[PDB]
Structure 1
Amino acid sequence: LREKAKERNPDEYYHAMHSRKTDAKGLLISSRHGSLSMDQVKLLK
């Protein structure tokens, strides 16, 4: 893992970067299950 970190290319681009997000600390955030619109909420309520 350390070698992978050292050899990382700063200019590597993947289309999935738009969907994936990173925390303030710098770590990847992963959704536990993978928001509700009001019309959906009204039915559920």
Structure 2
Amino acid sequence: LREKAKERNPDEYYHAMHSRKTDAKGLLISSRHGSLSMDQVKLLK
């Protein structure tokens, strides 16, 4: 893992970089399960 970090290319681009998000700490954020519209919430309420 330390080696993978060292040889990382800063210019690597993946289309998925749009969907994935990173935390202020710099660590990747993974959703627990993978918002509700007002119409959906109204039915559930």
> Identity percentage over the alignment?
100
Unaligned runs of 5+ in 2: none
Q: Hey, what's the Cα distance between the residues in 2 that align with 1:4 and 1:34?
A: 27
Moved over 6 A (4+): none
TM-score, scaled relative to structure 1: 0.99
Report the alpha carbon displacement of residue 2 of structure 1 after superposing the two structures with TM.
0.2
Q: Hey, what's the Cα distance between the residues in 2 that align with 1:38 and 1:30?
A: 25
In structure 2, the partner of 1:2 is 2
TM-score, scaled relative to structure 2: 0.99
Count of paired positions:
45
The Cα offsets for residues 3-42 of structure 1, whole Å up to 9 and x where unpaired, read as 0000000000000000000000000000000000000000
Report the alpha carbon displacement of residue 43 of structure 1 after superposing the two structures with TM.
0.1
Please provide the CA RMSD for this pair.
0.2
